[PDB]
Amino acid sequence: MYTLNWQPPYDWSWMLGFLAARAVSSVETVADSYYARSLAVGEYRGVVTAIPDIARHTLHINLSAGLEPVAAECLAKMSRLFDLQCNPQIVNGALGRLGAARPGLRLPGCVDAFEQGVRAILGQLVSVAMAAKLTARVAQLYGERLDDFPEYICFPTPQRLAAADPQALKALGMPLKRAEALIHLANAALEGTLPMTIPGDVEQAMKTLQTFPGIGRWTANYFALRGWQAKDVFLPDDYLIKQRFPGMTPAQIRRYAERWKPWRSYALLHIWYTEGWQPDEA
Amino acid sequence: MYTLNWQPPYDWSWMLGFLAARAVSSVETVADSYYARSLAVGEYRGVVTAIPDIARHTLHINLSAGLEPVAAECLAKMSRLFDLQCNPQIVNGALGRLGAARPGLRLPGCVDAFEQGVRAILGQLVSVAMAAKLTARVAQLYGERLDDFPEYICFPTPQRLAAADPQALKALGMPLKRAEALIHLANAALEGTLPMTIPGDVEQAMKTLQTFPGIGRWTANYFALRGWQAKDVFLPDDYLIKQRFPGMTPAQIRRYAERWKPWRSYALLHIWYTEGWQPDE
Amino acid sequence: MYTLNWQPPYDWSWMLGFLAARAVSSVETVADSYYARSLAVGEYRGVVTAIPDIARHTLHINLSAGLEPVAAECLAKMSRLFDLQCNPQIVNGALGRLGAARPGLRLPGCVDAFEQGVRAILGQLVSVAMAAKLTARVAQLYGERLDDFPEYICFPTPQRLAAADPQALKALGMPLKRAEALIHLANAALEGTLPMTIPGDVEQAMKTLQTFPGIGRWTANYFALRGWQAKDVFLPDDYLIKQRFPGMTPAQIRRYAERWKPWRSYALLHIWYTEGWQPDE
Amino acid sequence: MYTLNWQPPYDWSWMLGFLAARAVSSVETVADSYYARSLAVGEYRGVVTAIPDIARHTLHINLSAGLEPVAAECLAKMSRLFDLQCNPQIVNGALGRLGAARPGLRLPGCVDAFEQGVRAILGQLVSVAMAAKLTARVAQLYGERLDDFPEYICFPTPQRLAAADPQALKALGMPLKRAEALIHLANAALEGTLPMTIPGDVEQAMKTLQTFPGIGRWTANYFALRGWQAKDVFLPDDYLIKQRFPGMTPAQIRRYAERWKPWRSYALLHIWYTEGWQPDEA
DNA sequence: GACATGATGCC
DNA sequence: GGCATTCATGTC
DNA sequence: GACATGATGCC
DNA sequence: GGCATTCATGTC
């Protein structure tokens, strides 16, 4: 029903694929022509379906009855998830050749920072696929099933995970420290200590984040990028990034990434997806 | 020309009137058929125009080209300002006759939690007309002018106010402590330590706000009310509220207001805008 | 057979009586002519016997073999416990008739600040008699027995109390918060956070002690008085003192006691042991 | 006047030699057969004189009239300064060969932890002689001169040093950070945050001390050794110690030192005062 | 990956 | 020597 | 109104 | 007693 605009080009196949690789069973459903998932906004709950319309650079959004009262907020969440604000001419013209292969690349955000926070923590160490598996388990045990849509389940709320037994979370396939990290996060969410929207001083906020137990700088950076859609952060501690820069120290990697300012988040995404990229031969 | 729904009844006259009295010159323009104001998301900017369609039970929103890239977020901000989510049959079903006279009453939110915190602070002790004349000075001195629309001006950002000279703020017409509060508040905004959206535990969040310099219980409650649109808060420390509950102490009032849980914020609005109202026996 | 002199007059009957009511079973032994207790200085342990010789106004201190390596430290502890430094002329010639009925009165100190800290907390609320018994139960559960003196037990160290089970301490007959107060005080002594000797700014030091869980103003003043032997602290919050100043609020009492600076601690003792006493209106 | 015992052997010549080299004019006097210094215990001030008695294995202590009211504490202070508690058979029987040459070695303590902390800081990065003169000036400037013995001045009180102008101290011959380090130490002493007696967990206590400005691991260790007379601390970061363990790093020296637990402080002394001492090759 | 921990220059 | 800051380890 | 100070009821 | 919390009160 609702419709939002975007600026061409937009690589939807890339986006939908990025999301499917990380999709959580019972929460999300990704296809080649649409994206759908459970969504909670306060006590309002339902299903959101996003259908891209290439021919007209439009994104059609449908909301089940339970979300209609907070429609505009659901749209906002969706626009942050898909980076509809992106102007590719600006970014590509700045990254130059690094983005030429896929100019329609966008930054995959989230629909809820707390959720992304939990996702990031569970993304620690393991493969993208294993994290998706792990998150699906946390969701199954602590999530709420939708009454109108049985097949779906809402992502575990902050209050439900805050009152979760560390031993139980551990039993799902994570170390005790990780489970504690999740619980602490939920408490920060309840108290409003976890920025839910992008803060004015990203660098500073990431520091405060790193004081959180179980949250190192990789998690803080990745969370900044996905949870806040911060556009100028690189991930020099990333597993795949260390590979892309063979034999380089975390600090050299960024003095390097420094050339992509102020769109280092986009450069990061391009490097991750350039099969055989290597630093300039010079 | 975007469109958003709302559920009847909706007292637009009352809403626009409430915003009109607190309207900040150059930032907001309030008429009785529409509301408009400057708006900044990140640093995409423009002007927003909201026009109620009583006929269709709809709110029409127009955005200038500079905000189009972030249209959705803009629509969300308006839906919070106008309490479009409200189901009046549920609130009134609970408040009984307290809300029977003005079933279309809504909670006036805000477009940005930071701006609202600043308004809250600049609203202390002084009158409503004053706060508005003062806030306008600030927005005039630290606001971002729109090239697209010269007449309008964006509300100060936290970075712009965090780097502000205290004395400079004071000279605009406020005690030094106030100006200091604004600067602290702005910093907190910069490092995400100020909840920009309603937290799960509103009580805890408000307590934490009270450790902020220049922020007492009244300011935290009012902030929670408009800033987060928390629906179950009361202001037992409010000037007018004390007059509405003659001789009762903050604790006695708060005890009385418990009868309106979980919609105390709405109860508050009704008692505020119902002069001569008084507690039962 | 060690000797430390004092200045007459010295009311030994009053001192022993005071320590007698607070004596902890298995730790201390008090009679009309001597004081005896177990003492530990680091890993050196043994029994200390103090025998006052009025005739020559000198205190005879005997140390079991286990404490000889640290004889001096033991002597210093006795001197602090018995306030042998006091010049009663300077105090009595400063308190007037307040301290005229008993000019030999002294500030009963302690042998170890941590111990006194524990006694202070356990001294909260309950009577002297119950506190003594409560404390005895703690020493019995965590104290170290002496090989050469099976009847004696060493007062618990911070090492043991810090590793104590809150529940174990609770079962001894104390609120959970009280046991938690002990465990925290013990951790503080382990990290050197608990001043074991009178600090330069007693007021500041006490204010900091009040940040400790379970330690309010009364415990901090009393600890400062007995644990650091601070000579100028009053206890406006004390029960007996409240009765000595009927109708007066802590601030009034506090203001009244200012007339006794800088020997308020002594003034406190005298007012405590003068059933008649009443202020001047 | 007063007499304290000690267990033989006791190397008085070595002990007085160590104190003499670090003696502060105006505060102390060290001679072949005696030690003397000003001493303040609250408002009681005077001069303490210590004369060893080899024939009797005793230390004779004389106090000037001004300290008699607090005689016992003065005796205790001297006992800590001269390590009278030490049972050499236990240490040597444990240190073995290391202390076989000088079985009468003792741990030079202090008469006041605050004072010692100050000396510890003033002794940073300079020669023993330099520190002595530096300290003497600090003493003459903020100390209390004795009326009965004009040539003696009591070491500066915390209250006095806390209210000192950072610049006046710098002028005496120390960096500006060194002066603030002293002022900070002084306020800590005023509030009761600087442990004046040995804490139960020396390790934790030192860790906290290192949070003090101007105080690093070296100063914290040295302070524990002298100010608290901790008997099981080593100083792997000491310049001289590094020369005694050529080519080894702090972690290695430290690892090797563990063989002397629980008397690492005595080991340190024996090594410090042993010329071409070197670890075992094997 | 989080986190404790050990190994050039400047002030 | 205190101290800031960047690599290289190395359990869990 | 925020904010120091003082001055009832549940652990 | 410790401590959270309430009700003046005087100031900025």
What is the set of domains in chain A, with CATH numbers?
Answer: 1-112 (3.30.310.20), 113-230 (1.10.340.30), 231-282 (1.10.1670.10)
Of D76, D189, D208, which is closest to C191 when you measure between CB atoms? D208
- CA nearest to A267, candidates A17, A110, A96: A96
A94-103 long-range contacts, Cβ below 8 Å, gap at least 24?
A94/A260, A94/A263, A95/A260, A95/A263, A95/A266, A95/A267, A95/A270, A98/A260, A98/A267, A98/A270, A98/A271, A98/A274, A99/A266, A99/A267, A99/A270, A101/A270, A101/A274, A102/A11, A102/A14, A102/A270, A102/A273, A103/A9, A103/A11
Rg (CA), chain C: 19
- Quickly tell me which residue has 């027995």 as its tokens: C145
Would you state the structure tokens that stand for residue D61, as one six-digit string? 């202590």
Give the span between the Cα atoms of B191 and C231, in whole angstroms.
Answer: 48
Return the sign of the alpha-carbon dihedral for residues A19, A24, A30, A35. negative
Asked if the Cβ of residue A215 lies within 7 A of any atom of strand E, the reply is yes
Rg (CA), chain D: 19
Classify residue A173 as exposed, middle or buried by CB count within 10 Å of its CB (0-12, 13-18, 19+). Answer: middle
Q: How far is CA D156 from CA B190, B225, C136, in A?
A: 46, 57, 42
Give the span between the Cα atoms of A110 and C281, in whole angstroms.
Answer: 73
A200:B191 CB<8 A: yes
Give the span between the Cα atoms of C271 and C259, in whole angstroms.
Answer: 14
| Helix extents (H) in A201-247 | 202-210, 217-227, 239-244
Contact (CB, 8 A) for B278 and B258: no
Give the span between the Cα atoms of B24 and B30, in whole angstroms.
Answer: 10
User: Which technique was the structure solved with, according to the deposited record?
Assistant: X-ray
Contacts (Cβ under 8 Å, ≥6 apart) of D147 = none
> What's the CA angle centered on A273, arms A268 and A278, to 5 degrees?
75
Give the span between the Cα atoms of D198 and D196, in whole angstroms.
Answer: 7
Helix/strand/coil percentages in chain C, nearest 5: 50, 10, 40
In terms of DSSP bridges, do strands C28-30 and C35-41 run parallel, antiparallel, or are they unpaired?
antiparallel
Would you state the structure tokens that stand for residue D59, as one six-digit string? 């230390």
- Torsion angle of C-alpha atoms D131, D77, D195, C23, degrees rounded to 10: 180
- Torsion angle of C-alpha atoms A52, A53, A59, A65, degrees rounded to 10: -80
Contact (CB, 8 A) for D174 and D214: no
Q: Which of A43, A63, A194, A196 to mutate to test the interface with B (most CBs of B within 10 A)?
A: A196
Give the span between the Cα atoms of C100 and B111, in whole angstroms.
Answer: 75
Per this entry, what is the length of chain D? 282
Q: Does B211 touch chain A (CB under 8 A)?
A: no
The per-residue DSSP string of B120-151 comes to HHTTSSS-HHHHHHHHHHHHHHHPEEPSS-TT
Q: Is C104 left (phi over 0), alpha (psi -120 to 50) or beta?
A: alpha
Return the sign of the alpha-carbon dihedral for residues A18, A19, A20, A23. positive
Contacts (Cβ under 8 Å, ≥6 apart) of B13 = B32
Mapped onto helix, strand or coil, the DSSP state of residue B156 is coil
A200:B159 CB<8 A: yes
> What's the CA angle centered on B232, arms B229 and B237, to 5 degrees?
95
Q: Residue D273's CB: how many other CB atoms inside 10 A? A: 15
C44:D85 CB<8 A: yes
Contact (CB, 8 A) for D30 and D39: no
Which protein residues have any CB–strand G distance under 7 A?
Answer: B 124-125, 175, 210, 213-220, 237-239; C 175, 177, 249-252
Give the span between the Cα atoms of A33 and A16, in whole angstroms.
Answer: 8
> What's the CA angle centered on B128, arms B123 and B134, to 5 degrees?
65
B200:A157 CB<8 A: yes
Contacts (Cβ under 8 Å, ≥6 apart) of D250 = D236, D237
Contact (CB, 8 A) for A46 and A53: no
Contacts (Cβ under 8 Å, ≥6 apart) of B115 = B155, B156
> What is the enclosing helix (H) or strand (E) of B194?
none
Options A83, A237, A238, A280, the catalytic residue: A238
- Chain centroid to Cα D276, Å, comes to 25
3-state secondary structure C197-216: CCCCCHHHHHHHHCCCCCCC
- CA nearest to C158, candidates D237, B100, D199: D199
Contacts (Cβ under 8 Å, ≥6 apart) of D272 = D238, D240, D241, D244
Residue B276 distance to chain A (closest CA, Å)? 34
Give the span between the Cα atoms of C169 and A83, in whole angstroms.
Answer: 59
Q: Residue D270's CB: how many other CB atoms inside 10 A? A: 21
- CA nearest to D77, candidates A255, C205, C197, A159: C197
Mapped onto helix, strand or coil, the DSSP state of residue C57 is coil
Mapped onto helix, strand or coil, the DSSP state of residue B73 is helix
Contact (CB, 8 A) for C221 and C234: yes
In terms of DSSP bridges, do strands C153-154 and D34-41 run parallel, antiparallel, or are they unpaired?
unpaired
Give the span between the Cα atoms of C69 and D109, in whole angstroms.
Answer: 16
- Amino acid identity, residue B21? A
Q: Does D87 touch chain C (CB under 8 A)?
A: yes
The most distant pair of C-alpha atoms in chain A lies apart, rounded to whole Å, by 60
Using a CB-CB distance cutoff of 8 angstroms, which residues of chain D are in contact with residue C163?
A: none
Give the span between the Cα atoms of A33 and D128, in whole angstroms.
Answer: 80
- CA nearest to B205, candidates B213, D212, C261, B197: B197
Asked if the Cβ of residue A8 lies within 7 A of any atom of strand E, the reply is no
- CA nearest to C121, candidates C188, C74, C46: C188
C189:D199 CB<8 A: yes
Would you state the structure tokens that stand for residue A173, as one six-digit string? 């396939």
- Quickly tell me which residue has 């179950």 as its tokens: B232
Using a CB-CB distance cutoff of 8 angstroms, which residues of chain B are in contact with residue A44?
A: 85
Q: Residue D237's CB: how many other CB atoms inside 10 A? A: 16
Q: Residue C163's CB: how many other CB atoms inside 10 A? A: 12
In terms of DSSP bridges, do strands D28-31 and D2-5 run parallel, antiparallel, or are they unpaired?
unpaired
Using a CB-CB distance cutoff of 8 angstroms, which residues of chain C are in contact with residue D193?
A: 193, 208
Per this entry, what is the length of chain C? 281
DSSP C268: H
Give the span between the Cα atoms of D9 and D92, in whole angstroms.
Answer: 11
Contact (CB, 8 A) for C263 and C231: yes
Q: Does C203 touch chain D (CB under 8 A)?
A: no
Across the strands, what pairs with D173? none
Contact (CB, 8 A) for A131 and A144: no
Q: Is D225 left (phi over 0), alpha (psi -120 to 50) or beta?
A: alpha
Q: Where are the beta strands (DSSP E) in B116-243?
A: 144-145, 153-154
Would you state the structure tokens that stand for residue B263, as one six-digit string? 């919609």
Please, what's the b/e burial string for C106-135 (b: 16 or more CB within 10 A of its CB; e: otherwise)?
bbbbbbbbbbbbbbbbbbbeeeeeebbbbb
Give the span between the Cα atoms of D31 and D54, in whole angstroms.
Answer: 16
Q: How far is CA D178 from CA D119, D120, D131, in A?
A: 11, 11, 12
* Residue D238, phi then psi, degrees to nearest 5: -70, 135
| Chains touching A by CB (3 or more pairs below 8 Å) | B
The per-residue DSSP string of chain D comes to -EEEE-PSP--HHHHHHHHHHT--TTTEEEETTEEEEEEEETTEEEEEEEEEETTTTEEEEEE-GGGGGGHHHHHHHHHHHTTTT--HHHHHHHHGGGGSS-TT------S-HHHHHHHHHHTTTS-HHHHHHHHHHHHHHH-EE-SSSTT-EEPPPHHHHHTS-HHHHHHTT--HHHHHHHHHHHHHHHHT-S-SS--S-HHHHHHHHTTSTT--HHHHHHHHHHHS--SS---TT-HHHHHHSTT--HHHHHHHHGGGTT-HHHHHHHHHT-TT------
D201 catalytic? Reply is no
The resolution, in Å, is: 2.3
Q: Which of C45, C197, C206 to mutate to test the interface with D (most CBs of D within 10 A)?
A: C197
Mapped onto helix, strand or coil, the DSSP state of residue A36 is strand
Q: Where are the beta strands (DSSP E) in B42-155?
A: 44-53, 58-63, 144-145, 153-154
Name the residues in C234-263 having a C-beta closer than 7 Å to nucleic acid strand H: 237, 239
